[PDB]
């Protein structure tokens, strides 16, 4: 992992094994075709969550999803993520891993 970045790895879901680099201030996650992290399932809202970098601090922010964004099984409006945290969006379960400072 490049310095200052982080990674999300899909552990459960139709694209299990897939993984996405977080290396910009805002990364969108949803079913909208232009989502940075495109999670294509009915359980996922068009705009579901955003992952922010502020600053050396990675945060997930639920942006008004229908069925919630879960961090370690608990729904959150916003939550600063720590390595090994499981993020659930619809049926997709991902794990967060921080890169170098």
UniProtKB/Swiss-Prot annotation:
Position of the signal peptide: none
List where in the cell it is found: Cytoplasm
Provide the transmembrane region boundaries. none
The record's keywords, sorted A to Z, are: Cytoplasm, Phosphoprotein
- What Gene Ontology cellular component terms go with this record? cytoplasm
Domain FHA intervals: 27-76
Q: Which domain of life is it from?
A: Bacteria
**Function, as annotated:** An essential component of the PknG signaling pathway. When unphosphorylated, it inhibits the activity of 2-oxoglutarate dehydrogenase. When phosphorylated it does not inhibit 2-oxoglutarate dehydrogenase.
> Under which name does UniProt file this protein?
Oxoglutarate dehydrogenase inhibitor
Species this chain originates from: Corynebacterium glutamicum (strain ATCC 13032 / DSM 20300 / JCM 1318 / BCRC 11384 / CCUG 27702 / LMG 3730 / NBRC 12168 / NCIMB 10025 / NRRL B-2784 / 534)
- What high-level taxonomic lineage is stated for the organism? Bacteria, Bacillati, Actinomycetota, Actinomycetes, Mycobacteriales
């Amino acid at each position: 992992l490049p310095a200052g970045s982080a990674l999300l790895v899909v552990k459960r879901g139709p694209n299990a094994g897939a993984r996405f680099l977080l290396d910009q201030p805002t990364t969108t996650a949803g079913r909208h075709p232009e989502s940075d992290i495109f999670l294509d399932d009915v359980t996922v809202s068009r705009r579901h969550a955003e992952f922010r970098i502020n600053e050396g601090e990675f945060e997930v922010v639920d942006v008004g999803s229908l069925n919630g964004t879960y961090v370690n099984r608990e729904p959150r409006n916003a939550q600063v993520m720590q390595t090994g945290d499981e993020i659930q969006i619809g049926k997709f379960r991902l794990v967060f891993l921080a890169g170098p400072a």
